[PDB]
JSON list of C-alpha atoms in Angstrom, two decimals:
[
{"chain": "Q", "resi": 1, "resn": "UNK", "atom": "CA", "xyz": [30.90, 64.32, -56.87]},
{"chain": "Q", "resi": 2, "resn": "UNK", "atom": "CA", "xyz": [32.85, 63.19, -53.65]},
{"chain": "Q", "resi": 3, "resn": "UNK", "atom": "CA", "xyz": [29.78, 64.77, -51.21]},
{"chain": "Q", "resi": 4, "resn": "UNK", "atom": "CA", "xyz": [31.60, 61.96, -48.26]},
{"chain": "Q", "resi": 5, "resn": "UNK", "atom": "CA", "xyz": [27.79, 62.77, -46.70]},
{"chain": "Q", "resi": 6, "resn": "UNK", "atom": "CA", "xyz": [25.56, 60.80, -49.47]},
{"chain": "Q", "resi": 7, "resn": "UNK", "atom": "CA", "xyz": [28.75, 59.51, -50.57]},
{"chain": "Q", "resi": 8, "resn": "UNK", "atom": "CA", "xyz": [28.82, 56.41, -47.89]},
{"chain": "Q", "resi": 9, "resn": "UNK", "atom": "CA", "xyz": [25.17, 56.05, -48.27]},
{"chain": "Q", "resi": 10, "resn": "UNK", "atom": "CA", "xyz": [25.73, 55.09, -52.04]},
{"chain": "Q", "resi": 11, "resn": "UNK", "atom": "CA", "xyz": [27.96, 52.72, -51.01]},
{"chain": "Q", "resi": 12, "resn": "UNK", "atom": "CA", "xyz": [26.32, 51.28, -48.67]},
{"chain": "Q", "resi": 13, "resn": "UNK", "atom": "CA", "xyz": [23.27, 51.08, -50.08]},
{"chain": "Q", "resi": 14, "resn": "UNK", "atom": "CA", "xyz": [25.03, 49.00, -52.75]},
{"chain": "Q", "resi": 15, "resn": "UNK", "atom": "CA", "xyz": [25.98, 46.82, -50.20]},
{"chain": "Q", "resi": 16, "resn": "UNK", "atom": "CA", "xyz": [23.01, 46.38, -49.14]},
{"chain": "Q", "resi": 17, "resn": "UNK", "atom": "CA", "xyz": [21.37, 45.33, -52.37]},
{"chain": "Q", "resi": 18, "resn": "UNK", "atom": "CA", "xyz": [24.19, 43.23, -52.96]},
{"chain": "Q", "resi": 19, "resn": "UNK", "atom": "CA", "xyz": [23.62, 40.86, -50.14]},
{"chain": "Q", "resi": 20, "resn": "UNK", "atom": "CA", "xyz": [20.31, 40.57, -51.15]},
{"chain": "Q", "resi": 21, "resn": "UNK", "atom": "CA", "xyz": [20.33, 40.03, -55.02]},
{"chain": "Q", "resi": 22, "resn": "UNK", "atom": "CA", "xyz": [23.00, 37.25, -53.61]},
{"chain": "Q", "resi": 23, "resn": "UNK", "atom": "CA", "xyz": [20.77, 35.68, -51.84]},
{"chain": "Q", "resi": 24, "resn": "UNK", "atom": "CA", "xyz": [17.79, 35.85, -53.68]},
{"chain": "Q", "resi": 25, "resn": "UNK", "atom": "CA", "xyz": [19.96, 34.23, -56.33]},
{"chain": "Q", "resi": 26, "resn": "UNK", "atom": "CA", "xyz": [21.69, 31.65, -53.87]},
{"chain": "Q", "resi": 27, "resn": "UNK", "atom": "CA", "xyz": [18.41, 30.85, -52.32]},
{"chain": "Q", "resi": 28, "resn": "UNK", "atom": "CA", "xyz": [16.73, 30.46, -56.20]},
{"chain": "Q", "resi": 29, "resn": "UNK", "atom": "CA", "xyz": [19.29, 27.86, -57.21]},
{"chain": "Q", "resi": 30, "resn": "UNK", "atom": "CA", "xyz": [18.51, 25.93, -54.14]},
{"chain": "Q", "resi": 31, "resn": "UNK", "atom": "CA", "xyz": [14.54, 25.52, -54.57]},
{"chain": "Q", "resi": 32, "resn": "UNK", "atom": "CA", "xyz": [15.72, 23.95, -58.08]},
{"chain": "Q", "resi": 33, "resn": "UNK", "atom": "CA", "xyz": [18.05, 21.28, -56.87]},
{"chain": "Q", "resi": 34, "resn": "UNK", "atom": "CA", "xyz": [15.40, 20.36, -53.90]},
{"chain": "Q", "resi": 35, "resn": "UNK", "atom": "CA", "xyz": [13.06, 20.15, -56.51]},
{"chain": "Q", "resi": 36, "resn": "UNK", "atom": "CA", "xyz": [15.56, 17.69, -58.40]},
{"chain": "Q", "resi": 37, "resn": "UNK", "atom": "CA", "xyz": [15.68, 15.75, -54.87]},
{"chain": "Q", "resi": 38, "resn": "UNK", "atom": "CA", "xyz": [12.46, 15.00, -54.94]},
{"chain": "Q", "resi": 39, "resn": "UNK", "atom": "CA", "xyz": [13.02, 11.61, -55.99]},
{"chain": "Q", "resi": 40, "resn": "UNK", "atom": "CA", "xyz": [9.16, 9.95, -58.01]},
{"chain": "Q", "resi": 41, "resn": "UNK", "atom": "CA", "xyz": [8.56, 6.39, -56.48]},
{"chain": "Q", "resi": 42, "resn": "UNK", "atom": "CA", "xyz": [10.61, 4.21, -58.47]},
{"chain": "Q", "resi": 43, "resn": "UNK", "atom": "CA", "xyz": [10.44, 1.15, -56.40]},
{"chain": "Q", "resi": 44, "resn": "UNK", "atom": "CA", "xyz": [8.69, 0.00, -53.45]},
{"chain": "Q", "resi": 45, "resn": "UNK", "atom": "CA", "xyz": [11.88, 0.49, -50.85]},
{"chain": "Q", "resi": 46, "resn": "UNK", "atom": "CA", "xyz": [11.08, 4.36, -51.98]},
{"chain": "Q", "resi": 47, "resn": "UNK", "atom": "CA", "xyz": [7.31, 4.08, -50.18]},
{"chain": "T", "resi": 1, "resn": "UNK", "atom": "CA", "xyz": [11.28, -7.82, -1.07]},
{"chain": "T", "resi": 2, "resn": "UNK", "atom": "CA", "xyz": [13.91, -8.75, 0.58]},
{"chain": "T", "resi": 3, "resn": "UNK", "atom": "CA", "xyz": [13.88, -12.72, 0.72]},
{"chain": "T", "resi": 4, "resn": "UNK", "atom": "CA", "xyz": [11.30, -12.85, -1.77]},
{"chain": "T", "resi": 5, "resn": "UNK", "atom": "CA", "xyz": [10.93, -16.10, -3.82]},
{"chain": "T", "resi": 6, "resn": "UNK", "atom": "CA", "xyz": [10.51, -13.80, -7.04]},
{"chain": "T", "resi": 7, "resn": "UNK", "atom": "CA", "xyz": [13.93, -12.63, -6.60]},
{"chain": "T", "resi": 8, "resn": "UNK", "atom": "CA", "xyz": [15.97, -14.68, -8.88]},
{"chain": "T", "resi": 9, "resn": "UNK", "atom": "CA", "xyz": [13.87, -15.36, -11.52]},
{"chain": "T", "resi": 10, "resn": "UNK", "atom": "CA", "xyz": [13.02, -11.80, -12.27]},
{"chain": "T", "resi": 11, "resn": "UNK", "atom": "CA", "xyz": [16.76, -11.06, -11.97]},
{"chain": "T", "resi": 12, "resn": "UNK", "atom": "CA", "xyz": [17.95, -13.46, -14.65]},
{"chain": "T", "resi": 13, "resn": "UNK", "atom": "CA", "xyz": [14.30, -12.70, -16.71]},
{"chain": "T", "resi": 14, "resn": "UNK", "atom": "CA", "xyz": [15.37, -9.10, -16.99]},
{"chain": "T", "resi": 15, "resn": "UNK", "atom": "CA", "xyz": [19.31, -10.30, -18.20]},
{"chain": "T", "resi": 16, "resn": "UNK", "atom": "CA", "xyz": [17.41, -12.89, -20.73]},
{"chain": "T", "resi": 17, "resn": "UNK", "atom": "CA", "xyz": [14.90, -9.62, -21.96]},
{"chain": "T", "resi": 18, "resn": "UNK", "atom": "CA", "xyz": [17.96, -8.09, -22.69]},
{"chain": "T", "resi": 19, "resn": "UNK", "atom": "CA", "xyz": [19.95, -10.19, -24.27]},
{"chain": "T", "resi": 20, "resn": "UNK", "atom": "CA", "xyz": [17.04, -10.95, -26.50]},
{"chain": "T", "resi": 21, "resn": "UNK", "atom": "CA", "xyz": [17.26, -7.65, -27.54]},
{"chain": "T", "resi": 22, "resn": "UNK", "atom": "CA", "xyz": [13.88, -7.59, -26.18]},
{"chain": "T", "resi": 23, "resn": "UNK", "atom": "CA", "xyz": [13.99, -4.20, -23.89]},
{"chain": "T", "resi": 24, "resn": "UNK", "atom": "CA", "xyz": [15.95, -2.61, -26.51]},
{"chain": "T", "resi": 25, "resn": "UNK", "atom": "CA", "xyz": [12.95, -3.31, -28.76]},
{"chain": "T", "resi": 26, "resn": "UNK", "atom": "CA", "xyz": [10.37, -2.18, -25.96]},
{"chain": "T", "resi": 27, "resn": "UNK", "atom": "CA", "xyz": [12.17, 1.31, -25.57]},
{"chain": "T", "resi": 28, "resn": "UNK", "atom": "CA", "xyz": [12.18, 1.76, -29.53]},
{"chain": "T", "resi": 29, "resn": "UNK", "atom": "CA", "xyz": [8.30, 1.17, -29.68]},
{"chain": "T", "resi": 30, "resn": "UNK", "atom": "CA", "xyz": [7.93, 3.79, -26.95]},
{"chain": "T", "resi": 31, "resn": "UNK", "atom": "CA", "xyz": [10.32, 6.28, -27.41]},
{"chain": "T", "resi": 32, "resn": "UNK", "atom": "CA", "xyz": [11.14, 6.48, -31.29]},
{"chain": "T", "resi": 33, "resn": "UNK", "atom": "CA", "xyz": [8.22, 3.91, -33.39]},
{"chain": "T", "resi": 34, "resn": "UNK", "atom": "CA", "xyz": [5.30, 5.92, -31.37]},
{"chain": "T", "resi": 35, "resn": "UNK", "atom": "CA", "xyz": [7.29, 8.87, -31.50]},
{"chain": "T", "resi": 36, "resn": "UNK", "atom": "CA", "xyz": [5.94, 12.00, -33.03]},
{"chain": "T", "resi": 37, "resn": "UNK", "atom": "CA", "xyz": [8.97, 13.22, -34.19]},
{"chain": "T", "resi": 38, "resn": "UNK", "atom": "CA", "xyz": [11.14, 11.62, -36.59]},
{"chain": "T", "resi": 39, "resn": "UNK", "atom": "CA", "xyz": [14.50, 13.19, -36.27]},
{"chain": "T", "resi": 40, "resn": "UNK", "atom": "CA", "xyz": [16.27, 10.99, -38.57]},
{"chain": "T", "resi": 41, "resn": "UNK", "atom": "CA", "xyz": [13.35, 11.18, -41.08]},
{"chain": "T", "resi": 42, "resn": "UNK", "atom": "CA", "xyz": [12.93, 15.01, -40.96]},
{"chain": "T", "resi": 43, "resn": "UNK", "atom": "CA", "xyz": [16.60, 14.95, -41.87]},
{"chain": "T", "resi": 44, "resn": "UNK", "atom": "CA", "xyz": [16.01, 12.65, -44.87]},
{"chain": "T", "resi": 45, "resn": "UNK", "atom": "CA", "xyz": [13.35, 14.71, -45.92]},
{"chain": "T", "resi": 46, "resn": "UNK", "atom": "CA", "xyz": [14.74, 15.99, -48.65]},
{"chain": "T", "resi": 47, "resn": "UNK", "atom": "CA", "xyz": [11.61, 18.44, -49.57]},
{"chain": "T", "resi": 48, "resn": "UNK", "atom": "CA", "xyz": [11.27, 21.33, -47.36]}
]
């Protein structure tokens, strides 16, 4: 129940794995649209 | 030197260098062309 001792470490803990989880799934999105960037060599002006 | 018959015509040869865009073009090929870092072109690297 409400044990305030393991009680905050719950929470935090969730915190925790909430930052992460975010950022795995920020930085995941990111290493698609760089991979979009990557523009093939269309023309010469590209080279 | 002082008095020197140089004088002049290395003054107005330096204004004419410049003018011609010439020095501007000498510190580019020193500084920035046979530079090992481009900063502009590790910001439009868009792959890192």
């Amino acid at each position: 129940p409400r044990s305030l001792s393991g009680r905050i470490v719950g929470g935090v803990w969730w915190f925790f794995t909430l930052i992460i989880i975010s950022s795995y799934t920020a930085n995941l999105a990111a290493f698609l649209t760089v991979e979009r960037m990557v523009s093939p060599i269309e023309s010469a002006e590209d080279l | 030197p002082k008095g020197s018959s140089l004088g002049t015509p290395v003054n107005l040869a330096v204004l004419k260098l410049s003018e011609q865009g010439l020095l501007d073009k000498l510190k580019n090929k020193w500084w920035y062309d046979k530079g090992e870092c481009g900063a502009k072109d590790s910001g439009s690297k868009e792959k890192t």
